[PDB]
Design an enzyme around this catalytic site. Structure first.
Site, PDB file in Angstrom:
ATOM      1  N   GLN A 114      39.155  61.778 -82.569  1.00  0.00           N
ATOM      2  CA  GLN A 114      39.252  63.032 -81.871  1.00  0.00           C
ATOM      3  C   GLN A 114      38.995  64.187 -82.837  1.00  0.00           C
ATOM      4  O   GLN A 114      38.496  63.959 -83.946  1.00  0.00           O
ATOM      5  CB  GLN A 114      40.627  63.123 -81.201  1.00  0.00           C
ATOM      6  CG  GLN A 114      40.888  61.984 -80.212  1.00  0.00           C
ATOM      7  CD  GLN A 114      39.950  62.035 -79.024  1.00  0.00           C
ATOM      8  OE1 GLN A 114      39.420  63.106 -78.716  1.00  0.00           O
ATOM      9  NE2 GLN A 114      39.758  60.907 -78.356  1.00  0.00           N
ATOM     10  N   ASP A 125      45.105  57.004 -76.705  1.00  0.00           N
ATOM     11  CA  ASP A 125      44.762  58.321 -77.175  1.00  0.00           C
ATOM     12  C   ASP A 125      44.840  59.309 -76.015  1.00  0.00           C
ATOM     13  O   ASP A 125      45.222  58.969 -74.904  1.00  0.00           O
ATOM     14  CB  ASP A 125      43.353  58.329 -77.779  1.00  0.00           C
ATOM     15  CG  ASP A 125      42.227  58.014 -76.816  1.00  0.00           C
ATOM     16  OD1 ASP A 125      42.372  57.199 -75.877  1.00  0.00           O
ATOM     17  OD2 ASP A 125      41.136  58.603 -77.018  1.00  0.00           O
ATOM     18  N   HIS A 177      18.620  45.941 -61.977  1.00  0.00           N
ATOM     19  CA  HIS A 177      17.522  46.495 -62.770  1.00  0.00           C
ATOM     20  C   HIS A 177      18.037  47.430 -63.869  1.00  0.00           C
ATOM     21  O   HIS A 177      17.581  47.322 -65.014  1.00  0.00           O
ATOM     22  CB  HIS A 177      16.522  47.261 -61.896  1.00  0.00           C
ATOM     23  CG  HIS A 177      15.620  48.146 -62.715  1.00  0.00           C
ATOM     24  ND1 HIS A 177      14.533  47.642 -63.395  1.00  0.00           N
ATOM     25  CD2 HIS A 177      15.624  49.475 -62.980  1.00  0.00           C
ATOM     26  CE1 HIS A 177      13.912  48.615 -64.039  1.00  0.00           C
ATOM     27  NE2 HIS A 177      14.561  49.742 -63.804  1.00  0.00           N
ATOM     28  N   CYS A 222      13.100  42.272 -65.701  1.00  0.00           N
ATOM     29  CA  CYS A 222      14.214  41.753 -64.904  1.00  0.00           C
ATOM     30  C   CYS A 222      13.742  41.115 -63.611  1.00  0.00           C
ATOM     31  O   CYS A 222      12.656  41.322 -63.075  1.00  0.00           O
ATOM     32  CB  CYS A 222      15.216  42.880 -64.653  1.00  0.00           C
ATOM     33  SG  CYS A 222      14.912  43.897 -63.195  1.00  0.00           S
ATOM     34  N   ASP A 228      39.389  49.891 -72.323  1.00  0.00           N
ATOM     35  CA  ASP A 228      39.832  51.231 -72.699  1.00  0.00           C
ATOM     36  C   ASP A 228      41.343  51.313 -72.455  1.00  0.00           C
ATOM     37  O   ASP A 228      41.847  50.513 -71.670  1.00  0.00           O
ATOM     38  CB  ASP A 228      39.091  52.326 -71.954  1.00  0.00           C
ATOM     39  CG  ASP A 228      39.142  53.677 -72.651  1.00  0.00           C
ATOM     40  OD1 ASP A 228      38.486  54.609 -72.133  1.00  0.00           O
ATOM     41  OD2 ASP A 228      39.814  53.807 -73.697  1.00  0.00           O
ATOM     42  N   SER A 229      42.002  52.238 -73.123  1.00  0.00           N
ATOM     43  CA  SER A 229      43.427  52.406 -73.283  1.00  0.00           C
ATOM     44  C   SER A 229      44.091  53.239 -72.185  1.00  0.00           C
ATOM     45  O   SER A 229      45.304  53.130 -71.977  1.00  0.00           O
ATOM     46  CB  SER A 229      43.708  53.101 -74.626  1.00  0.00           C
ATOM     47  OG  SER A 229      43.216  54.434 -74.645  1.00  0.00           O
ATOM     48  N   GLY A 230      43.284  54.059 -71.530  1.00  0.00           N
ATOM     49  CA  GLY A 230      43.710  55.038 -70.554  1.00  0.00           C
ATOM     50  C   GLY A 230      43.592  56.474 -71.041  1.00  0.00           C
ATOM     51  O   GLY A 230      43.780  57.394 -70.236  1.00  0.00           O
ATOM     52  N   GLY A 231      43.292  56.681 -72.322  1.00  0.00           N
ATOM     53  CA  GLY A 231      43.181  57.984 -72.947  1.00  0.00           C
ATOM     54  C   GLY A 231      42.226  58.945 -72.281  1.00  0.00           C
ATOM     55  O   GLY A 231      42.328  60.173 -72.388  1.00  0.00           O
ATOM     56  N   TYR A 232      41.235  58.423 -71.553  1.00  0.00           N
ATOM     57  CA  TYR A 232      40.314  59.327 -70.874  1.00  0.00           C
ATOM     58  C   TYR A 232      40.984  59.896 -69.623  1.00  0.00           C
ATOM     59  O   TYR A 232      40.821  61.084 -69.348  1.00  0.00           O
ATOM     60  CB  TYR A 232      39.016  58.605 -70.527  1.00  0.00           C
ATOM     61  CG  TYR A 232      37.962  59.478 -69.891  1.00  0.00           C
ATOM     62  CD1 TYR A 232      37.729  59.438 -68.521  1.00  0.00           C
ATOM     63  CD2 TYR A 232      37.204  60.343 -70.665  1.00  0.00           C
ATOM     64  CE1 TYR A 232      36.759  60.245 -67.954  1.00  0.00           C
ATOM     65  CE2 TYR A 232      36.231  61.151 -70.108  1.00  0.00           C
ATOM     66  CZ  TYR A 232      36.014  61.093 -68.748  1.00  0.00           C
ATOM     67  OH  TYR A 232      35.051  61.900 -68.190  1.00  0.00           O
ATOM     68  N   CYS A 237      12.303  43.368 -60.731  1.00  0.00           N
ATOM     69  CA  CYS A 237      10.965  43.895 -60.953  1.00  0.00           C
ATOM     70  C   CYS A 237       9.909  42.804 -60.891  1.00  0.00           C
ATOM     71  O   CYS A 237       8.725  43.110 -60.770  1.00  0.00           O
ATOM     72  CB  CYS A 237      10.920  44.633 -62.295  1.00  0.00           C
ATOM     73  SG  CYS A 237      11.799  46.222 -62.249  1.00  0.00           S
ATOM     74  N   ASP A 261      29.360  52.339 -74.085  1.00  0.00           N
ATOM     75  CA  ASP A 261      29.667  52.069 -72.696  1.00  0.00           C
ATOM     76  C   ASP A 261      29.354  53.321 -71.875  1.00  0.00           C
ATOM     77  O   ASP A 261      29.482  54.444 -72.356  1.00  0.00           O
ATOM     78  CB  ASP A 261      31.129  51.665 -72.512  1.00  0.00           C
ATOM     79  CG  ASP A 261      31.972  52.926 -72.365  1.00  0.00           C
ATOM     80  OD1 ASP A 261      32.369  53.490 -73.402  1.00  0.00           O
ATOM     81  OD2 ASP A 261      32.207  53.341 -71.214  1.00  0.00           O
ATOM     82  N   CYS A 289       9.239  46.253 -66.988  1.00  0.00           N
ATOM     83  CA  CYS A 289      10.564  45.653 -67.008  1.00  0.00           C
ATOM     84  C   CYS A 289      10.498  44.161 -66.693  1.00  0.00           C
ATOM     85  O   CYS A 289       9.761  43.745 -65.810  1.00  0.00           O
ATOM     86  CB  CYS A 289      11.514  46.336 -66.019  1.00  0.00           C
ATOM     87  SG  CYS A 289      13.120  45.500 -65.891  1.00  0.00           S
ATOM     88  N   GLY A 318      36.239  61.888 -77.512  1.00  0.00           N
ATOM     89  CA  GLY A 318      36.161  63.324 -77.303  1.00  0.00           C
ATOM     90  C   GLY A 318      34.770  63.885 -77.160  1.00  0.00           C
ATOM     91  O   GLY A 318      34.581  65.107 -77.182  1.00  0.00           O
TER      92      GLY A 318
HETATM   93 ZN   LIG Z   1      13.543  45.780 -63.629  1.00  0.00          ZN
END
Ligand SMILES: [Zn+2]
Ligand SMILES: Nc1nc2c(CCNCc3ccccc3)c3nc(NCCc4ccccc4)[nH]c3cc2c(=O)[nH]1
Ligand SMILES: Nc1nc2c(CCNCc3ccccc3)c3nc(NCCc4ccccc4)[nH]c3cc2c(=O)[nH]1
Ligand SMILES: [Zn+2]
Lengths: 359, 359
Positions: free
Chosen positions: A180, A133, A326, A297, A92-96, A300, A257, A295, A207
């Protein structure tokens, strides 16, 4: 492998599944990107992140610039080398943070500008570079939204020029623009129009996830995602809960994300096909079932709710590790199920089944 | 495999190397036992602990009784099942907390007594049960030391009777007695004599590492370890730094536990063959070498000092994970080198080489 290719293998309504090819590897879409803001995915080794199924992870310009520094990471060989992840990285660019945390047309002093942002992301060796942004706060009046949106579009143009100005970057990484316009249809269209005329390898919907509620987020997505070029990836930034992701894929989003699976994990919140659970709750103190009974993973397959309950309440680091592994595996399994049902033409059914069970 | 066997394969002076056979597995001696007080080795999966070379780990009666509870762990299938470690587990009795944290001949109310301690360790499913004692504080006058030592010897007798009174325990686990007597030769002898007349599967040297200094610890070991039966294991409780361990093996010790490799790891202290380092120090901010250039652990095969420096300063959990894995692997490598040099008859040389380099 090429600098960047996006191929759609299958569609169902607005939903698409496919692949992004980049030099450092292939990305299966719709894709979930674990976040790792400090040159780490919190509580997890990159091997573990990869084992869960992630094809790409997210890093952040603002935090890395502060600690350990972009120049220092460059000197040490780049982010991939530094944190031990050799697969694609989106930054990310820093816009947030421009919203989350003195501003002017030139940039923002916390100093980040389109140019500095793109250079920092170059110093990190990012594979997918986000334009710099301003994430517009919510709610916003049409006037503010418009003025905010226009500045970002000017900033998107400078981000492009900056990116294009650096050979090694231009030839080896990709650049995504960010739409935006708040919740306003005409502003969103003006933004999509500006972005497409500039031209990007991918388009993010910015946004949103700024306090507006899922109903309003889905409304805006309904009209905003078709405004973006169909033949490039569509990234919904910072989103979200499992049901958010499903509804967003139903409306044309290819990438995501979110800090949830990691943050929630450390806090003791586990995602399950039956819905989220608070493992600290006393009802689990002697629950020998895994976090989720379906699950796949490793967590689990080996540990019980009862054990992870104790770990979390005791403030043990392994509790954070296990919950996080998990949660991220869960998110990747969700993404796999979405990909499979879209390839097979049953995504509509899956989405309904999922919601019926999840809620 | 039998309940308990100890075989000496080789000796060099007072140093011995060999094997302890137990139902849940074999233990290579001289052995280092990672500590995992809350039903976890902090920041590490048991697979990782095992991968580092550990044959056995340590758990604790006092902490587990408090959280999550011994009865609850019993109900959940025992400690092995609960934390996912199927190899031998040694549990301390609580005797250190008796010093570390209302007392009488019957026991200590924090309520732990010889009987309750042995039962709790039975509830946990411990493989090596420690007698319930009182770790005598230092310094102690001869009078206090004697009175303290005598109570523990009475407590050791009750621990035996308690252990012997439970079939499943008596037939499947082992029981170690613990020598007290402070720094006093006659008290240590009276204690060893009492313990041997009672009879144990192994003998611990208690009451050291209580602030007396390595010089005085080695003095006491010089006369105390030959007082213990030669044909059973000798365990030095809570010890210690790498050089402590080497000097103790030189004086007849077969087993060790210590919080150092784990605690120090989280705090940013890394052990190396050249001595300990504080990875937070700014001199490492751009150090691309591994923690130690000869260490064989996965951490040192993949990550740099610079990276772990950043992680630790940023308070990232992965920093704790990586430091801890290295530290424990280091400790196990040290134990392997000690075992090999004693088998080969060069332990004296190793010990000198080590000290020359370490210091
Ligand atoms: Zn799991
Ligand atoms: N550049 C940009 N980024 C945005 C972000 C950041 C995405 N997540 C990256 C990150 C990860 C860890 C720590 C900080 C940031 C958004 N997040 C939400 N909702 C939650 N809404 C957002 C909108 C924008 C946005 O409009 N622009
Ligand atoms: N029962 C017993 N235990 C003792 C302990 C405990 C050994 N370590 C177990 C543990 C691990 C984590 C948290 C708490 C305890 C000793 N520790 C040192 N020095 C450091 N000296 C000690 C003497 C005795 C001792 O005399 N008796
Ligand atoms: Zn190492």
């Amino acid at each position: 492998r090429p600098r960047f290719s996006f191929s759609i293998a299958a569609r169902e309504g607005k939903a698409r599944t496919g692949t992004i090819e980049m030099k450092r590897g292939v990305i299966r879409t719709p894709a979930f990107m674990p976040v790792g803001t400090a040159a780490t995915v919190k509580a997890l080794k990159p091997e573990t992140v990869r084992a869960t199924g992630a094809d790409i992870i997210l890093g952040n310009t603002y935090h890395l610039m502060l600690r350990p520094g972009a120049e220092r990471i460059a000197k040490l060989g780049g982010l991939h080398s530094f944190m031990g992840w050799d697969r694609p990285i989106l930054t990310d660019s820093g816009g947030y943070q421009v919203m989350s945390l003195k501003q002017s047309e030139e940039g923002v002093t916390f100093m980040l500008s389109p140019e500095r942002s793109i250079e920092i992301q170059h110093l990190l060796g990012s594979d997918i570079v986000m334009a710099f942004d301003e994430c517009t706060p919510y709610p916003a009046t049409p006037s503010r939204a418009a003025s905010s949106m226009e500045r970002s579009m000017r900033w998107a143009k400078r981000s492009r020029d900056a990116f294009d100005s650096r050979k090694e970057q231009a030839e080896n990484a990709a650049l995504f623009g960010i739409q935006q316009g708040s919740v306003f249809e005409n502003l969103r269209q003006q933004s999509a129009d500006a972005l497409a005329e500039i031209g990007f390898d991918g388009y993010a919907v910015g946004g949103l996830a700024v306090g507006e509620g899922q109903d309003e987020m889905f409304r805006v997505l309904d009209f905003s995602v078709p405004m973006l070029p169909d033949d490039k990836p569509h990234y919904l930034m910072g989103v979200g809960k499992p049901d958010d992701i499903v509804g967003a894929v139903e409306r044309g989003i290819d990438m995501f994300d979110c800090v949830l699976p990691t943050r929630s994990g450390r806090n003791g919140q586990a995602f399950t096909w039956d819905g989220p659970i608070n493992i600290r709750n006393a009802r689990f103190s002697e629950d020998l079932k895994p976090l989720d009974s379906e699950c796949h993973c490793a967590v689990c397959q080996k540990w019980s709710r009862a054990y992870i309950h104790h770990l979390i309440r005791a403030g043990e680091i392994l509790g954070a590790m296990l919950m996080t592994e998990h949660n991220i595996a869960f998110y990747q399994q969700l993404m796999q199920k979405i990909r499979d049902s879209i390839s097979e033409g049953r995504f509509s059914q899956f989405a309904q089944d999922f919601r019926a069970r999840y809620f």
